[PDB]
């Protein structure tokens, strides 16, 4: 499902709802992230950055970067070093 929202969102009102229902369901699943997903680095990164990168946005950049600030304030060294390069 948010494989599907990410090839649906900004393809080419609506905008502003689809941007609080995104960082509702980040901001709650932020705990546990251990299931083997293999693919977070990849993708959830790497796609909204780049997604920004074309599309004027800064409400979810200040959501994505608060919750690095939680993260810090307490994945493995070597992942989040490649976020803070990423970025």
């Known amino acids: 499902s948010l494989q599907k929202m990410v090839r649906e969102h900004l393809n080419p009102a609506t905008s502003g709802t689809s941007e609080l ?3 509702s369901l980040e901001l709650v699943k ?3 992230a251990v299931m083997s997903m293999e693919m977070r680095k990849n993708f959830i990164q790497a ?16 959501a994505v970067v608060k919750i690095v ?3 810090v ?15």
């Open 21 to 23: 229902v995104m960082l």
């Open 69 to 71: 600030e939680e993260w």
């Open 73 to 87: 304030k307490n994945p493995t060294l070597r992942e989040k070093s490649i976020l803070l390069v990423k970025m």
């Open 47 to 62: 796609i909204l950055t780049s997604l920004i990168e074309k599309s004027p946005d800064a409400k979810i950049l200040r």
């Open 30 to 32: 932020t705990r546990l």
